[PDB]
Scaffold this active site. Structure first.
Site, PDB file in Angstrom:
ATOM      1  N   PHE A   1      32.336  50.596  65.713  1.00 47.76           N
ATOM      2  CA  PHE A   1      31.024  50.760  65.101  1.00 47.76           C
ATOM      3  C   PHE A   1      30.469  49.445  64.587  1.00 47.76           C
ATOM      4  O   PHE A   1      29.263  49.349  64.336  1.00 47.76           O
ATOM      5  CB  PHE A   1      31.096  51.780  63.967  1.00 47.76           C
ATOM      6  N   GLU A   2      31.321  48.434  64.425  1.00 47.05           N
ATOM      7  CA  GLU A   2      30.877  47.101  64.055  1.00 47.05           C
ATOM      8  C   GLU A   2      30.722  46.180  65.257  1.00 47.05           C
ATOM      9  O   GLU A   2      29.982  45.195  65.169  1.00 47.05           O
ATOM     10  CB  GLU A   2      31.863  46.472  63.064  1.00 47.05           C
ATOM     11  N   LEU A   3      31.389  46.482  66.375  1.00 45.85           N
ATOM     12  CA  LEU A   3      31.304  45.606  67.539  1.00 45.85           C
ATOM     13  C   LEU A   3      29.968  45.766  68.253  1.00 45.85           C
ATOM     14  O   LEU A   3      29.375  44.775  68.694  1.00 45.85           O
ATOM     15  CB  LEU A   3      32.462  45.892  68.496  1.00 45.85           C
TER      16      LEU A   3
END
Length: 154
Positions: A83-85
């Site tokens: 979800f951060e990449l």
């Protein structure tokens, strides 16, 4: 929006059996069979391919919620990293476009892991924390389940 929630968890091969049993079968089964919610589970509904990241992004956009199961394995593998990449998912989380339900199954005793998870928490605008006490919480119609269901849509 075709799915009520996007289920995010991590499974590692052979450390508590009740936690894994709750995260892998009890949680989805009670959410879908007993309460009638529709969940998208990557390990069940999506076959890895060359468009895996784009597919997961699209499925998150079609999900009314994002459930994260904070098991020891999830912390080991940093299952939240996806979800951060992806920039779109990161924007969705920080701008509040999707509500996140963080299920705490263990305590963040580790210093580094605790700091990282705190940074993740602050990175989410709409965050709902629910603690999983254990066998008491897995019981049907418990405090845990009422809380979780209220945090779910409809």
């Amino acid at each position: 929006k075709e799915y009520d929630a996007y289920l995010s968890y991590t499974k590692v091969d052979q450390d508590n059996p009740e936690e894994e049993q709750f995260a892998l079968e009890v949680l989805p089964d009670v959410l879908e069979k007993h309460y009638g919610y529709k969940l998208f589970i990557p390990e069940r509904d999506l076959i890895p391919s060359g468009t895996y990241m784009e597919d997961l992004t699209r499925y998150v956009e079609q999900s009314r919620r994002l459930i994260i199961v904070l098991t020891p394995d999830y912390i080991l593998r940093r299952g939240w990293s996806i979800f951060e990449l992806e920039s779109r998912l990161h924007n969705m989380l920080v701008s509040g476009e999707i509500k996140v339900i963080l299920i705490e199954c263990t305590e963040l005793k580790g210093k580094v892991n605790c700091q990282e998870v705190e940074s993740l928490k602050r990175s989410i605008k709409l965050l709902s924390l629910i603690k999983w006490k254990g066998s008491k919480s897995s019981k049907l119609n418990s405090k845990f389940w009422k809380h979780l269901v209220y945090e779910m849509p409809i």
